[PDB]
């Protein structure tokens, strides 16, 4: 994995040693070249994973999350060029440094073969993420957002640290490959109940689980555009990736310990979807959409079937491109009107004809229109949960209705109707804005043709 780690580190010298007026050009160009080379990780075999060394490996679960990660960095640099326009050069090159350092921790996190190496980099992503939110947020609530985003994660991460070390002293190794052959069943005792929670609550908070989600509406809303894109596109999937790995060593206790977290997800799925029907902030509405969508991933991971895992992986990748796209679309409006209220600028389809097409395509994937990978992932989870309990179709069907209501309501409150009269600064769509959306949707739509590469290790 050094072939991707070293180039990522060399972007930092590139930014600092580049011309004062070429920081964006050089970083964007060379970050796209790193993304292009990540396609070599798809050399996957049907029996064994691609094991590079004692430290790093990449299987069919890590590969799609790596390509989305390295592909997201170029798109975050395009989105940041506007609000970082009157910023002094040194701080602009520090902002890019934080983004690069975040990618470096992420790709190593998704390939760490050792679960304690996974933990360190897993926690290492908080530092740059916190710095981006609090130093380059526009509102006074960004300072409070960082505290919520920091202490919610650490409140659950520290118990995970103890549990991981306890496992090593018992099994003898936290290397993932070894655990696949040395895993022993978990007895039903009170000690193992809290070992289960410690190993899982660190990831429930990041997914996030309903009830433990109050940090997301504060962090995703106060963060700059680049922070929101990575926050909702990759950093939420850090929790999902964690469960898919650590649930290996929690059987058969996951059969009953998952009930409280399936009801929070199945019901919290409906609640957060309902919240989006009455949100007065466009960015906040998208934040609550991630909570509703990630509720499916928790259910799929906790029922442990070949179809649930296939759906969860496609859902995590599908939501990553969609959620990032929606934040970018919402920011283009903000860059003009400079206000997050959803009912302030209406009828935008009359002033920005092309940007309205992106809104439609973004909304359709959000509501899982087939054959998009948004539907493929959601459909597979629905098939698996039906076999888990036939009554769940009621809850996951009601969520479909609500998801279509708030997604098209978002598309109708901003793009249709009557244009606001007193807003006269809605300039045409820049090439930067249009190209930013095309990069989100084209790969999202292209994956439909060959979707087996995002179906995970159980394909």
């Amino acid at each position: 994995m050094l072939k991707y780690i070293i180039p990522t580190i060399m972007l930092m010298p590139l930014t600092w040693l580049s011309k004062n007026n070429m920081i964006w050009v050089n970083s964007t160009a060379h970050s796209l070249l790193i993304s292009f080379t990540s396609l070599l990780l798809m050399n996957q075999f049907g029996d064994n994973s691609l094991n590079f060394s004692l430290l790093f490996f990449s299987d069919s679960l890590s590969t799609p999350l790596l390509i989305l990660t390295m592909w997201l960095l170029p798109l975050m640099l395009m989105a940041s060029q506007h609000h970082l326009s009157k910023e002094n050069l040194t701080r602009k090159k520090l902002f890019i440094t934080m983004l690069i350092s975040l990618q470096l921790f992420l790709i190593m996190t998704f390939t760490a073969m050792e679960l304690i190496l996974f933990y360190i980099l897993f926690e290492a992503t908080l530092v740059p993420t916190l710095i981006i939110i609090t130093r380059w947020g526009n509102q006074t609530e960004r300072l409070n957002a960082g505290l919520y985003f920091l202490f919610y994660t650490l409140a659950g991460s520290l118990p995970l640290l103890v549990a991981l070390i306890y496992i090593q002293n018992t099994v003898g190794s936290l290397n993932f490959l070894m655990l696949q052959y040395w895993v022993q069943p978990v007895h039903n005792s009170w000690s193992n109940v809290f070992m289960w929670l410690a190993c899982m609550m660190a990831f429930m908070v990041k997914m996030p689980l309903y009830g433990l989600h109050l940090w997301l509406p504060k962090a995703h809303v106060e963060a700059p555009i680049a922070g929101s894109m990575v926050l909702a596109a990759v950093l939420l999937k850090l929790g999902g990736y964690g469960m898919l790995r650590i649930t290996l060593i929690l059987n058969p206790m996951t059969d009953f310990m998952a009930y409280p977290f399936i009801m929070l997800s199945l019901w919290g799925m409906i609640m957060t979807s309902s919240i989006c029907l009455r949100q007065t902030d466009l960015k906040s509405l998208i934040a609550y959409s991630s909570v509703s969508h990630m509720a499916l991933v928790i259910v799929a991971i906790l029922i442990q079937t070949p179809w649930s895992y296939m759906g969860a992986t496609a859902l995590m990748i599908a939501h990553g491109l969609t959620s990032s796209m929606l934040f970018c679309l919402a920011n283009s409006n903000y860059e003009r009107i400079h206000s997050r209220t959803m009912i302030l600028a209406r009828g935008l389809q009359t002033l920005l004809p092309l940007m309205a097409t992106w809104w439609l395509l973004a909304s359709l994937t959000n509501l899982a229109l087939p054959p998009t990978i948004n539907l493929i992932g959601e459909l597979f989870v629905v098939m698996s949960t039906f076999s888990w309990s036939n009554i769940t179709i009621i809850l996951m069907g009601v969520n479909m209705v609500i998801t279509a209501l708030y997604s098209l309501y978002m598309l109708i409150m901003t793009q249709r109707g009557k244009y606001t009269y007193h807003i006269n600064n809605i300039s045409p769509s820049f090439t930067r804005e249009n190209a930013l959306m095309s990069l989100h949707i084209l790969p999202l739509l292209l994956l439909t043709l060959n979707p087996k590469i995002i179906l995970g290790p159980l394909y």
Partner: protein
């Protein structure tokens, strides 16, 4: 104070600590504690103001009372064993007084009320010695007598130090008091692992000394002693605020920084000994320390607090402060995690 006398006094503080470390006789250990205290009071009085006088008086009474208890433990040990070797004490009552005398010297809770006040009333340079070098000698004795220490007593002192250290620092706007309560909080970690693996006590001590030295050096570089005064550093020396952010984040125990190494290693040792509740409580309780560090980051680096007009007159002069080893200490305080297996040199 004449420079030559200042050097001689400083060397006497070190000689006092060194005698405690190299001595195999309790009387010589007690002598080192007396010499060390004798030569640290003068540097606390160097500024000759009422607050410095009060701080020295409180410091003298606490150490003096601790010293008497330490000599009482040695004599009781002598009665029941007839020897002075610096090893496990041979009477449980001697062990309690020795353990409690060392707690008072270290400032561990509930023998902590003096640390926030003594540190406040003395300059930053004096406070740096009090919080970093003064813990080498008491920790040396614990490293040698830990087999005979009562397990419940040492963990009770360690737990209360973490709680009171975390809670005390929340209500502080004076930096010297913030460091004073951060010293107490980190002390609990050192003495909490001591029964299980003394080596991790040394590892935590070294890391704490390096990080605490960096913060005091950076506070001294700008002569800042309050939260608001530190809030102008962005408008005077912008580079310094970035260093403070990295060090404060490290002191909070966040990965991938150096400060995570002692917390990470102490949990391992306690978990190997089937101690799961205490490390979890300690790790969670340390989030209080991470909080009031993060509150200094906001007021220093992550936000630009209001400035004053005369600050422009400071842009026309450079920093003449010595800032000795500051470039090296900051790196050791933030980028040493990939070298964690190097802790075996302490074994």
């Amino acid at each position: 104070m004449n420079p030559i006398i200042f050097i001689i006094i400083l060397l006497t503080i070190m000689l006092g600590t060194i005698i405690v470390m190299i001595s195999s006789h309790w009387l010589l250990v007690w002598i080192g504690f007396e010499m060390n205290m004798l030569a640290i009071i003068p540097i606390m009085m160097k500024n000759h103001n009422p607050r410095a006088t009060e701080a020295s008086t409180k410091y003298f009474l606490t150490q003096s009372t601790a010293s008497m208890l330490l000599m009482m433990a040695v004599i009781i040990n002598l009665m029941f064993s007839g020897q002075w070797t610096v090893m496990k004490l041979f009477n449980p009552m001697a062990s309690m007084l020795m353990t409690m005398a060392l707690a008072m010297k270290l400032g561990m809770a509930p023998f902590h009320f003096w640390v926030p006040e003594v540190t406040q009333g003395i300059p930053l340079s004096s406070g740096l010695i009090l919080l970093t070098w003064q813990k080498l000698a008491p920790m040396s004795v614990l490293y040698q007598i830990f087999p005979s220490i009562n397990l419940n007593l040492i963990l009770t002192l360690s737990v209360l130090s973490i709680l009171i250290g975390g809670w005390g620092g929340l209500n502080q706007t004076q930096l010297r008091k913030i460091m004073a309560y951060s010293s107490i909080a980190h002390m609990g970690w050192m003495t909490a692992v001591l029964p299980y693996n003394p080596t991790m006590t040394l590892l935590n001590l070294i890391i704490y000394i390096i990080m605490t030295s960096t913060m005091f050096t950076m506070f001294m570089a700008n002569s800042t002693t309050t939260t608001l005064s530190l809030s102008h550093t962005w408008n005077k020396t912008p580079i310094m605020t970035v260093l403070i952010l990295a060090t404060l984040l490290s002191m909070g125990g966040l990965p991938p920084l150096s400060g995570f190494m002692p917390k990470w290693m102490i949990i391992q040792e306690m978990t190997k000994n089937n101690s799961i509740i205490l490390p979890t409580f300690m790790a969670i309780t340390a989030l209080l320390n991470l909080y009031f560090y993060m509150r200094l980051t906001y007021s220093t680096t992550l936000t630009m607090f209001p400035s004053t007009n005369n600050m422009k007159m400071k842009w026309q002069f450079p920093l003449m402060k010595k800032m000795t080893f500051l470039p090296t200490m900051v790196v050791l305080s933030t980028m040493m995690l990939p070298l964690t297996p190097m802790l075996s040199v302490l074994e």
